[PDB]
Each structure stands twice: as structure tokens, then as C-alpha cells.
Amino acid sequence: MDDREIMREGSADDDMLVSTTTSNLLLESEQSTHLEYE
Amino acid sequence: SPQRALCLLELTLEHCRRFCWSRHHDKAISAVEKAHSYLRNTNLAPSLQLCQLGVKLLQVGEEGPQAVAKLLIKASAVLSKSMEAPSPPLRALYESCQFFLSGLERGTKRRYRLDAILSLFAFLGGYCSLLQQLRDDGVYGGSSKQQQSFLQMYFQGLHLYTVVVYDFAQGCQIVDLADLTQLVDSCKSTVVWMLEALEGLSGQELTDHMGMTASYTSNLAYSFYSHKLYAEACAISEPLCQHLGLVKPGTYPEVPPEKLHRCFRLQVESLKKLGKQAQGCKMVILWLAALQPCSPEHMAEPVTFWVRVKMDAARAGDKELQLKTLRDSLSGWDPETLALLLREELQAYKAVRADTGQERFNIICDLLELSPEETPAGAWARATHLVELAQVLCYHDFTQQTNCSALDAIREALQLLDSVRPEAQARDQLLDDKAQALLWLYICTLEAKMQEGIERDRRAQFLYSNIAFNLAADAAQSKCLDQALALWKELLTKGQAPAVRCLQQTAASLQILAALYQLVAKPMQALEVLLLLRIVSERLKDHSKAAGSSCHITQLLLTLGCPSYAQLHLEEAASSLKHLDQTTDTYLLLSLTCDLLRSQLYWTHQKVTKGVSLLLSVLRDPALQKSSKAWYLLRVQVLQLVAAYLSLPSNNLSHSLWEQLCAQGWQTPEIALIDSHKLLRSIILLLMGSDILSTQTSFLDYGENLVQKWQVLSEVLSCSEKLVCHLGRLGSVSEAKAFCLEALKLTTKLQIPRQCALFLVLKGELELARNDIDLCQSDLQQVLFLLESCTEIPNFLSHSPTCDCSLCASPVLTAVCLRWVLVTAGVRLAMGHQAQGLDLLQVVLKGCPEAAERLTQALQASLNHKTPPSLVPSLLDEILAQAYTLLALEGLNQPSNESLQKVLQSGLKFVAARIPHLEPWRASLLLIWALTKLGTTQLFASSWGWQPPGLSTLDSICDSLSVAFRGISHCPPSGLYAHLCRFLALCLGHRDPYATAFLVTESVSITCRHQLLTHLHRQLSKAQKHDVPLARIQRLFSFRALESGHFPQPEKESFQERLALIPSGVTVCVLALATLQPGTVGNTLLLTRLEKDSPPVSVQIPTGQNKLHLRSVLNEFDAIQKAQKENSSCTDKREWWTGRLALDHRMEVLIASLEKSVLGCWKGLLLPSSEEPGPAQEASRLQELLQDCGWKYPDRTLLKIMLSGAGALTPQDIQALAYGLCPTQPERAQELLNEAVGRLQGLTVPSNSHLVLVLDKDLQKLPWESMPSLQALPVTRLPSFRFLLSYSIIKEYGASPVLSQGVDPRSTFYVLNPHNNLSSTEEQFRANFSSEAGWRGVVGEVPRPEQVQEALTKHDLYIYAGHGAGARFLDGQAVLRLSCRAVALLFGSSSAALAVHGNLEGAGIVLKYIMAGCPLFLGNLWDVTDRDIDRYTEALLQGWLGAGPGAPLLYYVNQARQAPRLKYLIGAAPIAYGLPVSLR
């Protein structure tokens, strides 16, 4: 003769990889620049 | 006399000639003294005497500089005296010539001091004055030969000065300071005199004189430039170039362009470096003016200089100099010449590796104002300049300044180009121009589509977008690339060299086109483009580009599956490397790429040892870590090759090489694959920005980035495909789904339908693995729509074997079609439609070889090789192998088809031909073969001591399974590994107890092992960027940490090593279900009891015979769960409670059935073993007597364990044990056992003993802990026994404070009523919780993720009393990245439940908590109601927190099960994961 109890819900799952931190790779260095004759 | 002086001079000349050989000029020196006596005063005579002293010195050749200096000083004094006096006799000139000849002989010494140089300068100045006086005389002008000879001698003199100054400069160290610093003044003087002399000379004489003078001035400037006194080097070089340029155009017609190029080059270089740019640019203008009447190829270098000075001026902050162009300075030049110069400035600006948007925009604007539109040539030139404008506006926002979009500019350019009627000569240039316009139309339309996608994502922050691909654009846009390729093929395939202005642009555009083809998943057309690039590079003699193109061809050919053609192109690439400078970064990069390609070829050709050596050398090379984007891409390819080598079984490589490879940082292929993806994403961030891959910079288009952008996009899609396939094959469907979704988002952003279809098919397979038929069918229907959209029961399976359609000509589309058929067959077989599934599988079986043949023919047609590829390319072999595996399993279901039986042998032959590349499928087929040979008591009964109350077939089955096990054990798929291990454990039995125990242990929680290995790699990388326990745990969980040997010796040694680390007092029981049909649930239970200092005990319980079998128990559990879900819908309270009470009674009967009808007498294998000596003596006595009764495998440990629980062994259990172990004389055994139990009555069960339960993904569902025998024992669950060892390792280093010290009851965080749904729960726990000392939490509000993270990392106890497990507040991935210190009491529905989807292993957040290091995890196995779980929570909290310090949590977990009204529906729900935990 008791009332009804509410059933707790077990929700659930995205599992997104994210991890966008990255190592901020070093940009290509300058890497910039014949005059030999008698 | 009038001719006496001439006679004396002639005699002295003959004397000097003799002195050159015989030194006869000594008697002639005496004769000269006699002449000076006869002629008292004669300047010619004194000069002759000085020249005689110099001739003596030249006979000495080289001597002290003092003598030469004195002789030259005397000569200078004599010359000054003669010239000052009015005596310009030719005899003085003859004496000076003799002295100069003597010095030239002395010039062979090539040794002169600064003083010697100055003295020679003074002598040369006197001689020059005399020569000028002689030229002033009318005699020189009267005879042209006389003037010519006078000039010849004059320039010969300064030429000697040149040689002297030039040699003096070389023979000088850094110490030489003022030496050249002063020599430079006289250098300016000589230049001035030489230029002054050039006046008057005309014709060939003039051309020669400017030539020579320029030659020596260049020689002196070269040396002066080297001295770093640029200021001095300029001062000398100014007037010559000023004269050479400001003259009227055409005055100097034949002076060589390069000879002028040198002098101007030196000045501009000096002008540039000295830091003043302005007159450097003006010098470039003067340089162009000097060469104005000539071809443009010479003007190319002056143009490059202009850009260098201007780029440096822009860098140095100057903006006024940045603005000025050549139009603002070269006014007056014929527009044609001006336009060609502007084209060269644009090209030099493109060469720059910086940001040059406005600079190019300004040039394009001036070019467009300059070209007259009305003329046809003007329209064609305007079209070209509009293509340039299209590029600039395609990657920069100048639309407000120009009032035109890139698309409109390029479309107008195309309209202008299609109206061009060209001359027969300029047809090739039109071809190249149209190809560039079409390529850049494609690029700009693609960029606009990308920006639309980015804005679309930024607005609505996607299966609708997948079908939202406009077909019109797909065909029309792709046609642009096909037409550009046709034009370039026409231009380049001809024998004659193309008659185009810039073949360098053609090569760059071809690289961009090849990158685009590889992105649009059209690789054969990329192969054609790369063959054209090699033709262009060979014409340009650019060995770097030829080598790079050959390397790309080899890579693409290996990806397509052809090793022999790749080998041909690899040797072609190797040959070009020899023509390259070895100190250049390009050479190193291409050599390392070639070594990587040889390593891959050796891998494909089964030369694994050589390939491993090469790969190791590449990995250990210090140059690989250079910070450049090409080096990053090389590292990506290196990582993919590492993954390829890690997928090989252990027998292919020796132990030492395996350790050497794994020591580089990656142990499993997926780890290496994930790192390649991360590196690719970092490259994408460097090239562009995060917008292409995320939702929220400037792109530097210096040509290199252009091709690299598309290359990296193609490579990230390829790496994602590899990762998805590998992870799905393993069984990690969630991570594979995540990668697939990311890739699909990228492909929808870029609007590529082929790659979209590929990833949709992969997603469909992943959803099929989860038994989600609805979403799988949705994905497959999307695939079908995309395939019908790209092609212009499906129609592509009706195509002819030799078909030339879009689907059949493209290997990618053919693979997608076959994969779609495979997934559709799987769906039909999972829906119970056997026939249609089998027919679809047969379609796949037929299709794969036909597709291989078509690709073979297409490859031969593209590459024009006479011999066909040795073997058909191997890219569809995995699809064929999977089809064979599925058909063999289906034949297992139907043992009476007689064709599917032959399919097993066909598949085994196919896979055995391709060892070791198809090993997982070989293992699956071998397992199916073993099952066929197996198909009651079954053959396992002879190998097991307890039967329930080579040559032999079993030996052959064991050998086959051993081969399969060693084929997959290095990187095992979860389901196949579990099946193989448990089948081998059944076969081995008690013949090898240790091998059986190892096999049972290895079969549980393999996916968790893979995930832990990946997480450990991430943590080690994080630590290294910013570890001994981590290394030990990685070695513990590794798959390759085995010695060499035959099965199962190294595995047994590793197991015994693991057995030695078991903590004392811990009993490990592994319960596993033996499955004799993949996809089903077995009725055989494998139980292994692992203890310290005790041999492992294993028992098989066949439950299929009993009416209550394991499958029945699982079905009843699922029925109870379903009814519980259905009962909550009821609104009548009384009926609701009646249903709840019935469900509780069903649960109680289920638990009783577990203990009584699944385990039976063996329940004692789960119970602790006594330390009292009675049971051991009893077992020792009983072993012999029972061996006489018929015990096949007498085990003292088993008897001791069973006899240690003699106080509760019922006569039914004793009868079962006796009648099972001893089947020949059962009653004698029963009598002995009964007597032993009688003498063992009154034993004390050990107190400090703990049980760890390792269950199967199916057996984990059941409430084992609530069995009547286990209600008084401390029981927890662990994913695996290696997790117990990892817990011990962590505990040694003090990384688990709760397991080392205890739980501080004041360090607690609670989340109560987070969603404000459960009001009864809050009122009951709010005050009690808030009133506790040091307790902090969130009531009525959603906790922030930082709050939950601090709860888990900083507190010792975490209590969640809301809905579910709170996976929304902190998802499993966040929990993984933390260190779990707290005890997680998650009171919610299905909190500790693992979701079993299909044949995949259970998944849940409890696993993430355990891998994060949680000491203990308490949660519910199924769904509960709020009030009764509140009663359980209150009882547990009161009992544990009120017990006092040093109170075990598990004791009050067990005691609190009596609190709920529903004892077996609510009280049986809570289970504990981890290790026992007490209070501080």
C-alpha cells in the first residue's frame, strides 16, 4: 500500500578524441640563402 | 750621335734577352757603364742601368723586398726626372718596357709587399704618363697600328697591376688591414684611367677594350668584395658601371652580358649589404639600362636583385621604398620590355618564402593598366594577369581595393583565353596559360566551398549535409582538373622542349595538381601528373624535383599495392640523388625518403631483417628531427612504416630486433598510427588554422605551402582510414567511431563525395559491430546515394568485369562498393536472411580478383611498362579474406553444404599464400578448421581430471591453434583472442596446468589492455615533454615482452614471473565462458584459482548437461531486467509493488541457482585456503589412495583447497567430487573423502584473505557477490589479473595514497540531486551530508567539470547520489586523464555495469576509473529505485563512518545489503571494483 518510487535513470558516450593541445610545432626556420672566379 | 742611343738600347735589349738564359748582361752592364762614360748624362742610360739591376734581381728571381723596392724607387726617380724634362724620347719608353718585362719575369715569383705594390704603382703611373704623352704626339694617330700597340702596352701594364693586386689580395690573412684599405685608392685611379682611355675607341677595338677593362675591374672587385670592405669595393666599381649604363642604348653592342653582370653584381651586393637600399635599387635600374638592348634571360638576375633589396627594405621597416615599382622608375621603356620585366618581378616575388600579397597585387594592377585590352595580344596578356589576380584574391582579402572576386576574375580570364587565336609558335604558351587558369578556377571554387562550410558550421553549432553535396559542382568542378591535365599532357608529351616562358611554374602547378588528385581520391590521375612532373624536371635538369617526383610515384605505387613498379621508380629516384650536392638539406631529405621506401619495399618483399635495419637507421638519424614541414611529413611516413612493422608476428624478426624497434617509443601499430594523426593535425595547424578541423590565422602561399596543404589533407584522410580499420578490427569500435566521425566532418567541409562514401562505409561496419542495424542501414543508404551521385539492389554489382565507368575505373570506388556489399551481407546475416547474405558474400569473392585485374591493366596503361606487374596488386586482399572468414563461419552454422566446406580450404590457401600480411584472417580460419575437426563428452574430457557425474585429432587441433595464437598474439583482436585462448585451454587441460592457467587469464579484458597501453604511451609522452612505474606497467601489459621459443615455453615463463608477484592473502579467481561457436554463449565454465606460492588450479564445469545451464541463467537475468523496465510504466501502486516483489523473488532464485547449479561442489575453489596444517596432510595422504581409485591427474593443491572448506562440504558435494574425479572405483573414493572431511571438521577460515573476481563480458552481469557462500567474504572485481599486479606496482612507489594509508573520512565530496529531480533523496541526505566534518559538495545544481575533477584528484572519497553515474559532469575520457585518488561511491542506476553490444567486450566508466587508478569503485549492476537505494546508502554510510578508524569498506558493503526492503532486487545491485579499502 506504499507509493511508487522513482526509478533512477542510468544516462549513458561521446568519447570525443579532443586532445587538440598539440605541441605547437616550430614553424619552418628562415632557411634562407657562385661569386668565385679569376 | 743621333742613333747612338738607339744602338745602345738595342744592345741592352739583346743583352737582357741573353740574361734571360745566360746572364750575359754583366759584360753588357759594363758596356752600359762605358756608354754612361761616353754619354755623361742620359736618362735612358740610367733607366737601362736600373733595369739591369732589376734583371739581376729577376735572375735571382725572388729575394728580399728591399732590393726590389730600391730598384723600383730608382726607376721611379729616373722616370720622374725624364718625364718632367722635355725629353719624351721613345728610348725612355723602350727602357720602361724592358723594366716592365723584367717585372713580369719577377711576377712569376708572385711575392710583393705593400711597399713593392706602391713602387710598382709609381712606376706604372710614370709609364702611363709617358704613354699618354706619346699618344698625344701625332705619330700615334697617324698610324692606326701605332696607336693600337700603344693601347696594347698601356693595358698590358695595368693588367700586370691587376695580376699583382689580385695575387696580393689572395696572399693576405685577416691580419692584413690597411694594406688593401689603401691599395683601393690606386685601384680607383686605375679604373678612372682605364675608363678615360676607352674614349675614342670604336668598333671591334672598343668592344674588346670595354670587355678587358670590365674583366680586370671584376677581378679586383671580386677580391675587394671578399675583403669585406664593400665600401672600398663600391668606390672602385661605381664609375665603370655608370659609364656602361648612362651611355646611349646600343653604344656598347657586343660587350658580353655576363661580363657586365659581374661588375654590377659586386656593386649591388656591396650596396645591399652596406645597409643602404636606395641607390642599390637605383644601381639595379642602371644595371637594367646597361643591358636594355638585349635578351630578357640576362635581365632575369638583375630582376632577382631588385626583389632581394626591396624584400630586405620591407623587412627593415621601410615602407616608402616598398611602394616604388619598376614602372615608377623605368619610364620610357617600350611597354613590351616593361611588361616582361614586370612578369619577372612577379616571378621573383613568388619565389620569396614570406608574405608578399600587396607587392604582387600592385604589380598585377600596374600590369593590367599597362596592357591595351582592345588588341588580341593585349586580351591574352590581360587574361594572364587576371589569373595572377585570381591567385592573389584567392588567398588574400583585397576585394574592396579591386571590386572583383577571385572567381569573377578567373572567369573573365577564361573568357578572354577561349577567344585567343594564337600563332603557330605561341600555341604551347596558350596551352600552359589555359591549364593554369583551369587549375586556379578549381582552387578558388574549392576555397569558396571551404569557407561556406566553415561559416555553416559556425552558424549551426550531420547526415543531412552528406546528401547536401551538389552533383552539378562535383562533375563540372572535377572536369576543370581533367581538362588541365589534358592540356599539360599535350604540352609535355611532345618530343620537342615546350616553348613556354616559365617551365618552373608549370612544374609547380603540376605538383599542386597532383596533390589535388590525391585529395579527391583519384590516385591514377595523380600518377599521370607525377610522370609529367618527371618529364618537366628532366628538361629543367632539376634533379631535386626529379627525385621528389620519383619518390612520390614510388609511395603512390606502394599504396596502390604494386611493389615491382615502385622498385623501378625507387632506383630511378636513387640515380637522381647522385647528381646532387650531398651537404644540402634536400639531399638528406630525399636520401632518407629513399631509405624509407627501400624499408617499405623490403617489408612488402618479406626481407624483414634488412628492412628493420634500414628503418632503425632512419629512426636513429639526427636529421629526422629538423624543424621543417617536409621533415614533419617524413616523420609521419616513418611512423606509418613503424606501425606496418609492428603488425608482423614474432617469428618474422629476432628477439633483439623486436626490442630495438619497440625501444624507439611505440609498441603497438595503433599507438604509432594515433601519433601520425596527431603530427598531421599539428602540421595542419601550422599550415592553415584549426577552422578546417575544429569550430571557433593567415595562410602563407609561398608555393611550397600550396602543395603541402592539399598533401596534408590527403594524408590525414589516409591515416584516419588506417586508424579506423585497425581499431575496428581490434574491437575498439568507440575510438574508431570517433575517428570516423572526425574524418567525415572534414570530408563534408571539403565537399569530397568519394572520401565521404569511404568513411560512411567504415562507419556502417563499426555500427554493425555494435549490433545497431538501424543506424548501419541508414549509413549504407547514404553510401548508396553517394555512389549513385558519383557513378554518372544497386546497379554497380551488375557491371561487366571489364568496365570503364567511374566506379570501375577508380580503385577507391571499387573498394567502397565491395565494402558496402560486405556490410550489407553482414546486416542480412544479422537479420536472419542467410541466403541473401551468402549470395552477397559470393559477389564479393568474385569481385575482388576482377578489380585487381582491372587495376593491373590500368597501372600498366598509365606507366607504359611492357612486362605486366609480377603479381596482382594487394589492396583488396583484406576484403577477400574477411569474406572468406564470414563464409567459413556461416558454413560452421550449416555443416551440410559441401561448398562452404571447400570455402574453408580455399580461404586457408589464399591466406597461407600471403603470410604474414593476412595473419588475423588465417587465425580465424584455423579456429574454424579446429571447430570443424571437433564437431557430448567431447575430446577435452581426457585432458581434464574431473568429468561430471600430431597423430590424435586433439594434437592436430592444438598444433593448429598454436600456430593461430602465435599469428595474432602480438596485437590480438579481442574476440578472436578470447576464443582461441579458451579453446586452447580446454584442449590442454591438466596436461599443462600452467599453460592452461595462462590461456584462461589472457582471454579476459583485452580491449582494456589495448586502451591502457595507449593511455600509458600518452602519459609517458606527456612526462617526457614536460616514469619508472609507467615503464614497468607498460612491460607488464605489453604483448611483445617474451623470449624466443616454441609454444608455450616463453608464455609459461612470463606467467610464472607474473605469478611470483601476486600479493599474499589475495585469491584470484578467473571465471570465463568457453565458446564453441563465435557469436554464441557457451555452456562451459572455466575457473582458475591463482594464489601465491601455490600451483594454479583450473577446472572445467560443463553446464549444458544440467537443466539449469549458464545460458538459462543469463536469459533469466535479462528477462528480469526487461520486466523491471516494463513494471515502472504501471500507475497502480499495489500492482507495481506486486510486480516488484515477484521480481525480487526471481532474483533470489537466480542467485541460488548460480551457487547450487553452476558451481556446485567447486564453490570451494572461490573460498580461502586455511593456514592450519590439517588439510595439507589430508591431501598428501589422499593423493596416493585416490590415484589408485582412478584419478587421472592427481592434484594435491586441488584436494587441499577443497578439504580446507570441509566444514561446509555437503554429502551431495562430496558425492559429486568423488564420482567425478574417480570414475572407475567411485565408492571407495567417496568413503576416503568422507573420512577425510570427518577428520577435518572444526577448521577456522582465515580472516585476512581477499577474493578478486575476474569475469567474462557475459558473466560480469550476474550478482556473484550475493551468493550465500560469498556473503561473509571480502569480494571485489578487477578487469584482469594484470590489473592486480599493476595495483601492487603503483603501491610500491606510493602513487595510491588510499591503498597505502587509508581513507580520511573528512576528505569527501558529494553530488546530491544534481538535476533537481529526486526530492526524497535530498531531504534524507542533505543535513546528514552537510553536517559532516569537512564534507563539501553540490546540492541542487549541476557540478562543474572542474569540481568533479578536484573531487577525484584531491579528495579521498567521492559520493554521487543522483541519476546514473554522472558521465555528463565528467566523461570517461576526462577521468582517464586524471589520477584517481578517491573512493568512488557512485549510487546510481547501472553505475558499475558494462554495456555488452554484440560480441564486443563490456564498456563502462568503471573501467576508466580503474585505469585511472581508483582504489575502490562501488556501483550498481542494474537499475534501482530511489528510496531503497537511499536506504542502502544510508545504512552503508552509517555503518562504515560510525565503525571507527581501520574499518573495511567491504564489510559494511555486505552488511548494508540487508537494509533495503527488496533484498535481492536492490541489495544485490551494489558491487565493488578494485582493491579492499579501509579507514585511516
Ligand SMILES: [Zn+2]
Ligand atoms: Zn562499371
